Design a protein around this ligand. Structure first.
Ligand SMILES: CON[C@H]1C[C@H](C(=O)NO)N(S(=O)(=O)c2ccc(OC)cc2)C1
Ligand SMILES: CON[C@H]1C[C@H](C(=O)NO)N(S(=O)(=O)c2ccc(OC)cc2)C1
Ligand SMILES: [Ca+2]
Ligand SMILES: [Ca+2]
Ligand SMILES: [Ca+2]
Ligand SMILES: [Ca+2]
Ligand SMILES: [Ca+2]
Ligand SMILES: [Ca+2]
Ligand SMILES: [Zn+2]
Ligand SMILES: [Zn+2]
Ligand SMILES: [Zn+2]
Ligand SMILES: [Zn+2]
Lengths: 169, 173
């Protein structure tokens, strides 16, 4: 795993998230579920808890975008960069952006929203790209048919606990 | 990507550089622009920033030299070795020297100063020679045309970020 104990991690255990907009690719219920599931992968092995907001600035602002979208890193059309996120902090830090030029799907027939969102929130919590190839934090989208086999790698758990510790239970 | 033995890296996130002398090959402003652009490629993907000094010792002392020049490794005349730089650290470390027996150029008609300067500053920041053929840090200068297309390869990016991490306000690229 790769962390950089200069860069601040979140100073609190309870984080807020807000889904700012929805992709035409999927039913709003699936976006909500994918995000919820992605957040749970991390709450499970740390003492981090999350709550949703519908107005104001949540710590982790989640949005779909295309090309230029208000930050210094424009998306690139179809494929390649699927989404990006910023490490802990105020403002844009902790935010996660998803490229709508990708076809977001609940299965593996396009870009699986859940898996990429899980990786993105990784970034939102202070995790950087892992060198380990089976890690969720590995920067490579494998059109991984077996979503039924997904499991956070020991590397991912080791990395996120390095910053926040284990769950209290 | 490779690092120097022992992972030396700068501890400060902000470094100073000073251009000590100028080559007869190019006007001074073109030398300055090539160096600025060479520093900029790395600034863009790390938390590192740089500031120019015009007197005294900057972390990264940049100079043109020929044959013996006051250090352990004399240059070798036209061709072959083009420049050499030192790993992060005090004094001579972090410095970058360019062989003036090469024809330093703004384009590809001679040895592109920008390109070799970018590889040298790589060295000054802690990166060693990549075994990956398309990495700026591959130790071979080549028959490249499009300077316009220039972008650090992922291997160079993963190298320098393994050392410094990415820009604080930026995603990992
Ligand atoms: C080294 O840069 N690589 C990158 C930059 C960007 C990324 O990691 N964003 O978080 N891409 S990506 O968008 O293709 C990507 C994003 C999420 C992911 O989840 C499993 C795997 C790959 C891969
Ligand atoms: C033993 O290493 N081989 C070497 C030693 C020396 C070097 O790497 N200086 O940094 N050379 S070189 O001078 O030919 C060289 C320098 C810069 C460069 O930038 C794109 C490509 C090649 C190639
Ligand atoms: Ca894209
Ligand atoms: Ca935020
Ligand atoms: Ca879409
Ligand atoms: Ca020095
Ligand atoms: Ca030479
Ligand atoms: Ca010359
Ligand atoms: Zn963005
Ligand atoms: Zn990523
Ligand atoms: Zn020298
Ligand atoms: Zn070199």
């Amino acid at each position: 795993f790769r962390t950089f104990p200069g860069i601040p991690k979140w100073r609190k255990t309870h984080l807020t998230y807000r889904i700012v907009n929805y992709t035409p690719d999927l039913p709003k219920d699936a976006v909500d579920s994918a995000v919820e599931k992605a957040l749970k992968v991390w709450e499970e092995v740390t003492p981090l808890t999350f709550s949703r907001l519908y107005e104001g600035e949540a710590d982790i602002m989640i949005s779909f975008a295309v090309r230029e979208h208000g930050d210094f890193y424009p998306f690139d059309g179809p494929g390649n960069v699927l989404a990006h996120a910023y490490a802990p902090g105020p403002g844009i830090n902790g935010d996660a952006h998803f490229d709508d030029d990708e076809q977001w799907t609940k299965d593996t027939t396009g870009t699986n929203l859940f898996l990429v969102a899980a990786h993105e929130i990784g970034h939102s919590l202070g995790l950087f790209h892992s060198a380990n190839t089976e890690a969720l934090m590995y920067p490579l989208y494998h059109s991984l048919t077996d979503l039924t086999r997904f499991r956070l790698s020991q590397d991912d758990i080791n990395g996120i606990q390095s910053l926040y510790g284990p769950p209290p239970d």
